[PDB]
């Protein structure tokens, strides 16, 4: 699917003739399933049928369920996306710590390099030079924590020294919202690959289902940081709409200009292929 459908209004959803049926007292509209990529329910008054959920699982469409506050609550995870998952589990169990730490280190280097590119586009020479120094100083096992220092200096330089990631302000709320959406898309891509999402490539002690999808989604955070930095003065609703405009906007991949969903799918495919082939090629994404 190419289309992200967001339903914030109360209505009933059915599945008829390979077609999503939106039925509401004011009007009814039918949208084909093949064109639909992501389905987002932003309200608790929406009704759906289990048959349409089964058709969405067969169509491999990500379904997101939000709360009354409109923040995402729980997303649907299919058990078997493809038959290659059961064969990929043995490869994930056969993975090596050198390949995991190497791919994760290269991914963190791509994220820090993207932050230095964002500060370079923002015309900060000292900040991007320091973040570039931390990128050149990144090492295996991360003994210096140059990634966390790059994040602290990045947010502290962008939003001011008094700003922090632990604050309850709408800036951190929008950051966690964009990280939740990108984490949902990357997690759905990991479900398409079939590998276990709970197994991370960095720390084996930390146990989280979103760890792998976060490690894959680390390089794309600065794209959310840019719109969050531009819309920071706007209200949280307009910032959420601008965050929704990221799906409509296109970004330039090394090969050509593509949509965000295609870049995430191809990037995750190259990451899984690189993990199974033990680092044949590392995909690099630049702003």
């Amino acid at each position: 699917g190419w289309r992200t459908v967001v339903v914030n209004i109360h209505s009933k959803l059915s599945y008829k003739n390979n077609h999503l049926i939106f039925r509401n007292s004011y009007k009814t509209e039918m949208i084909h399933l093949s064109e639909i990529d992501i389905l987002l329910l932003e309200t608790t008054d929406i009704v759906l049928t289990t048959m349409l959920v089964k058709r969405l699982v067969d169509e491999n469409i990500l379904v997101i369920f939000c709360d009354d506050k409109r923040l995402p609550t729980a997303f649907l995870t299919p058990y078997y996306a493809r038959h290659d998952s059961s064969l990929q589990i043995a490869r994930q169990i056969a993975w090596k710590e050198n390949v995991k730490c190497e791919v994760w280190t290269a991914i963190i280097a791509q994220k820090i390099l993207n932050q230095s590119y964002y500060l370079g586009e923002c015309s900060f020479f000292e900040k991007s030079q320091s973040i570039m120094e931390l990128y050149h100083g990144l090492e295996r096992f991360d003994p210096s924590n140059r990634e966390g220092h790059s994040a602290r200096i990045y947010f502290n330089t962008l939003f001011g020294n008094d700003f922090t990631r632990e604050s309850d302000n709408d800036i951190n709320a929008a950051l966690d919202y964009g990280y939740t959406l990108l984490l949902s898309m990357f997690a759905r891509e990991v479900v398409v690959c079939g590998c276990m999402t709970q197994i991370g490539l960095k720390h084996a002690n930390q146990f989280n289902q979103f760890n792998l999808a976060s490690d894959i989604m680390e390089p794309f955070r600065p794209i959310i940081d840019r719109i969050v930095y531009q819309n920071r003065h706007n209200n949280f609703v307009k910032i959420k709409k601008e965050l929704f405009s990221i799906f409509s906007e296109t970004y330039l991949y090394n090969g050509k200009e593509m949509y965000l969903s295609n870049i995430v799918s191809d990037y995750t495919k190259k990451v899984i292929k690189a993990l199974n082939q033990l680092g044949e090629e590392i995909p690099e994404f630049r702003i």
């Binding site: 190419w2 289309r3 992200t4 459908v5 967001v6 339903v7 914030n8 209004i9 209505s11 939106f22 509209e29 949208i31 932003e42 309200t43 609703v237 307009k238 709409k241 929704f244 405009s245 799906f247 409509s248 949509y259």
Partner: peptide, 11 residues
């Protein structure tokens, strides 16, 4: 041909 389809308030 719209990428983001919104059924609800148009914000």
């Amino acid at each position: 041909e719209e990428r983001l389809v919104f059924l609800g308030d148009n914000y």
